[PDB]
Amino acid sequence: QYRKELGAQLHQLVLNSAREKRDMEQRHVLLKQKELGGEEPEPSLREGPGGLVM
Amino acid sequence: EGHLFKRASNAFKTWSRRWFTIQSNQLVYQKKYKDPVTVVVDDLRLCTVKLCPDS
């Protein structure tokens, strides 16, 4: 029973990972295509001016 | 079209609110008012939808 229930789950996991990584390769592709940007990224302030975390 | 919360691409993965549109079998998110949109899923006819009861 555990050998089967671990096994049925591992074959759904692999098909799920295949799909998740397909989905991740295509989105990986997309960023490099047209929207990656060349300008420096911006430091993000938080916790208002009296914590002012940056 | 409407507000949703999502997780950022920073290393902490911190949550953030953006305005999302479903149109022509696509899901896009708006990055500023009056400026081009960015695609979130390429197609919806190839999607599945998780109701997450154990989260």
UniProtKB/Swiss-Prot annotation, chain B:
Describe the effect of residue 12 to W.
Preserves membrane binding and ability to tubulate liposomes
- Localization per record: Recycling endosome membrane
Q: Look up what happens after changing residue 21 to A.
A: No effect on interaction with ITGB1
Q: What is the effect of changing residue 6 to N?
A: Loss of binding to PIP2 and PIP3. Loss of association with endosomal tubules when coexpressed with PIP5K1C
Q: In which tissues is it expressed?
A: Highest level in lung and spleen. Low level in heart, kidney, liver and pancreas.
List where this protein forms a coiled coil: none
Q: What is the effect of changing residue 12 to E?
A: Almost abolishes membrane binding
Q: Which domain of life is it from?
A: Eukaryota
The misc remark on file is: Cells overexpressing ACAP1 show an accumulation of ITGB1 in recycling endosomes and inhibition of stimulation-dependent cell migration. Cells with reduced levels of ACAP1 or AKT1 and AKT2 show inhibition of stimulation-dependent cell migration. Cells overexpressing ACAP1 and PIP5K1C show formation of tubular structures derived from endosomal membranes.
The free-text domain remark for this protein reads: PH domain binds phospholipids including phosphatidic acid, phosphatidylinositol 3-phosphate, phosphatidylinositol 3,5-bisphosphate (PIP2) and phosphatidylinositol 3,4,5-trisphosphate (PIP3). May mediate ACAP1-binding to PIP2 or PIP3 containing membranes. Only one PH domain of one ACAP1 dimer inserts into the membrane, while the other PH domain acts primaryly to interact with adjacent ACAP1 dimers.
Q: So what does this one do? A: GTPase-activating protein (GAP) for ADP ribosylation factor 6 (ARF6) required for clathrin-dependent export of proteins from recycling endosomes to trans-Golgi network and cell surface. Required for regulated export of ITGB1 from recycling endosomes to the cell surface and ITGB1-dependent cell migration.
**UniProt subunit comment:** Banana-shaped homodimer laterally assembling into tetramers, the tetramers further pack helically onto the membrane. Interacts with GTP-bound ARF6. Interacts with third cytoplasmic loop of SLC2A4/GLUT4. Interacts with CLTC. Interacts with GULP1. Forms a complex with GDP-bound ARF6 and GULP1. Interacts with ITGB1; required for ITGB1 recycling.
Q: What is this protein called?
A: Arf-GAP with coiled-coil, ANK repeat and PH domain-containing protein 1
What is the scientific name of the source organism? Answer: Homo sapiens
The gene from which this protein is expressed is ACAP1
